[PDB]
A paper describes a structure:
Deeply knotted proteins, whose topologies may introduce substantial barriers to folding, thus represent an interesting test case for protein design. Here we report our attempts to design proteins with trefoil and pentafoil knotted topologies. We extended previously described algorithms for tandem repeat protein design in order to construct deeply knotted backbones and matching designed repeat sequences (N = 3 repeats for the trefoil and N = 5 for the pentafoil). We developed an approach for designing tandem repeat proteins that fold into a class of knotted topologies known as torus knots.
Residue numbers in the entry: -6 to 2, 4 to 27, 32 to 275
The structure:
Amino acid sequence: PRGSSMGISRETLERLSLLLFSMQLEKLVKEEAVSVETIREELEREVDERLREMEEQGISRRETLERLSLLLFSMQLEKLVKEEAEARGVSVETIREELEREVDERLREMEEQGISRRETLERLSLLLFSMQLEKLVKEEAEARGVSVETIREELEREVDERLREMEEQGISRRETLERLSLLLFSMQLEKLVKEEAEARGVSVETIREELEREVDERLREMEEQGISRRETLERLSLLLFSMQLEKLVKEEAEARGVSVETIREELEREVDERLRE
């Protein structure tokens, strides 16, 4: 009845998440800074205080991350749906229902439960990651003048090679959300690495090796403090998700011309609905 609590790990997905979240967090702290190290330690202290607060009421770090993700992914899905509705000239509800229809068709083909009978976070993740990945696929296909199928098959090939170069199973035998995250995170990382390489005037390899080194150093420090790789990922996701949420709220408020508190109120109604769930 016990599982990964026995020390048997998704190691590929964990490394990829460390790399991607580290990239995204570095960009966010650089934009927020004052000093970046000051912002980093400030965010660390705020997250630690919030963790103590949720411990004082009996909420674990994993559950805190789960609720924060419900907030963040709700915001990201809302922004993506709104942008697609505007680009297509239809309402947000139409885009939402088309996304649900498409994802449920794919799950049918796979002989799996649909989004309606899945857990709240898993359903939100499936919807959001499907839309993000499809947007990235169509963008890269347009940019390279190739087929969307070509893009998706090259991405699946690259991720499958990476997986099999680590004694792990292929992309064909992973569960739905894990494969979806593997694909999405790989694509997002490649795009971020390439754009930063162009912006800073250095090679892609420079960026990627700096990233790998930053992550290995953080992991060695955590191991020195007696912190597990899973806990390291959870702390990094807490920091990053808080920063992403705050940026999304600020930007949506500035774009709609409303106060930040109105953005939060709308999000909080919608989210407390799924939180009672």
